[PDB]
Structure 1
């Protein structure tokens, strides 16, 4: 079925330092699990079980489909 609201993951292209203590630190080529993507800041999770809000500039949702067809 669908245990817990978590079915979206995004990978980081560059590195970033969670400015605020609430934000989560990222790393170049790091796959972060998106938890809450409703607020301006996209909340993701790290392999360390840690979570925080991060911008959609150093990350990108995965699980895309055919190259030719791009959601349209």
Structure 2
């Protein structure tokens, strides 16, 4: 299993965020995958893997 040690304190915001403490020892789930906090058209925010998307841009 994976293990990371919190360097600082982290106050969760939403029920999907885990509030940790400095020196807290966490277990990395989902093979260290990387997620992003997103907001859908509906409004509800959430967590989605960054793996699944392609960025968008508008040349002004």
Using the size of structure 1 for normalisation, the TM-score is 0.43
Structure number with bigger Rg: 2
More helix by share: 2
Structure possessing the higher relative contact order (Cα contacts under 8 Å, 6 or more residues apart): 1
More strand by share: 2
